[PDB]
Enzyme design. Structure first.
Site, PDB file in Angstrom:
ATOM      1  N   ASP A  35      23.240  70.107  60.212  1.00 26.70           N
ATOM      2  CA  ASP A  35      23.180  69.830  58.784  1.00 26.70           C
ATOM      3  C   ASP A  35      21.739  69.709  58.305  1.00 26.70           C
ATOM      4  OD1 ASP A  35      23.546  69.008  56.188  1.00 26.70           O
ATOM      5  OD2 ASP A  35      24.315  67.003  56.679  1.00 26.70           O
ATOM      6  N   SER A 199      14.157  79.323  44.036  1.00 26.74           N
ATOM      7  CA  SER A 199      14.567  80.712  43.932  1.00 26.74           C
ATOM      8  C   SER A 199      14.008  81.340  42.655  1.00 26.74           C
ATOM      9  CB  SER A 199      16.102  80.806  43.981  1.00 26.74           C
ATOM     10  OG  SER A 199      16.548  82.109  43.673  1.00 26.74           O
TER      11      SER A 199
END
Length: 330
Positions: A35, A199
């Site tokens: 994770d 992004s």
């Protein structure tokens, strides 16, 4: 040193991925959920409330000659999906794919919430975010990657998640045969303890690319792709019959649909998520309403590039002095 381990979907939907981890002496092998969105290594154990264990493999520290109770240490964590666990702490030898850390903090669960109990395939979590998020008290502990770093050939690990198929976590090296083209690297903020990056935009299907900054985290521990409501609305508008359902808790779509792809930007590069990756199947057994793999982050407080996004790429988690993230197509 290096390590290399196969990671395997827990079910036909890729709801999560498990990776075998050796703990203790002799080894006790547990299947953990790696994770990159948390920083605790915790396991089902001989100390876990018996009614909260249903099929998981447990760590028994009393059977490990290298286990040592970390005196006075406790931990307690809550995740973004509302689940939680807590307990005490041992140090022990932990190996992943041939890579060994001695004195790793192994957090032993005394209590776990129902969602963990109900998932027989996940024996615990292995956190790979930054150690500043580790919940051990009063002395915060380091992640497996943090402990391994100095010994690694290169201070990196890579995530290569499969679509409906196994994949690979590598530690300490970049497998140049595992991706196509080049790796594009992008800046990381560690200010929130996550692999947080920006992004450069998105496209829906064969549509034009929209240049827009989307701050989010690379999180292997989250199943879906959570993005701003504007972006998500633009995606599902291209699917006939798709709608946001409050009763279901997100976007659903007719199971008879053919989903469009979703592209996200990494600098000047582009990662394409095939439409099939965004199908998470009937909302309930026998339903013709299917759950979407792209959902709104509104109300989460952060955008999350979860497995839906990451499994379309070869992802480098670069833990150099100034961390960065790399993405390549594959």
């Amino acid at each position: 040193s290096t390590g290399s381990a196969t990671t395997t979907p827990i079910d036909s939907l890729d709801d999560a991925y498990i990776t075998p981890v050796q703990i203790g002496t002799p080894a006790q092998t547990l299947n953990l959920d790696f994770d990159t969105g948390s920083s605790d290594l915790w396991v089902f154990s001989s100390e876990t409330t018996a009614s909260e264990v249903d099929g998981q493999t447990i760590y028994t520290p009393s059977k490990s000659t290298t286990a040592k109770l970390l005196s006075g240490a406790t931990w307690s964590i809550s995740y973004g999906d509302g689940s939680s666990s807590s307990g005490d702490v041992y140090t022990d030898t932990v190996s992943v794919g041939g890579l060994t850390v001695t004195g790793q903090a192994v957090e032993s669960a005394k209590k776990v919430s129902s969602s963990f109990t109900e998932d027989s395939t996940i024996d615990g979590l292995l956190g790979l975010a930054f150690s500043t998020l580790n919940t051990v008290s009063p002395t915060q502990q380091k992640t497996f990657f943090d402990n391994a770093k100095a010994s690694l050939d290169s201070p990196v690990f890579t995530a290569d998640l499969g679509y409906h198929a196994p994949g690979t976590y590598n530690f300490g090296f970049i497998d140049t045969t595992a991706y196509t083209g080049s790796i594009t690297y992008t800046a990381v903020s560690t200010k929130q303890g996550f692999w947080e990056w920006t992004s450069t935009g998105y496209a829906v299907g064969s549509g034009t690319f929209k240049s827009t900054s989307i701050d989010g985290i690379a999180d292997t521990g989250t199943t879906l792709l959570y993005l701003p409501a504007t972006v998500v609305s633009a995606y599902w508008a291209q699917v006939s019959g798709a709608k946001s359902s409050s009763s279901v808790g997100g976007y659903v779509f007719p199971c008879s649909a053919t989903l469009p792809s979703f592209t996200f930007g990494v600098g000047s590069a582009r990662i394409v998520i095939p439409g099939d990756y965004i199908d998470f199947g009937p909302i309930s057994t026998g339903s013709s309403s299917c759950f979407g793999g792209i959902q709104s982050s509104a109300g989460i407080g952060i955008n999350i590039f979860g497995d839906v996004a990451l499994k379309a790429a070869f992802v480098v988690f670069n833990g150099a002095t100034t961390p960065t993230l790399g993405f390549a197509s594959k």
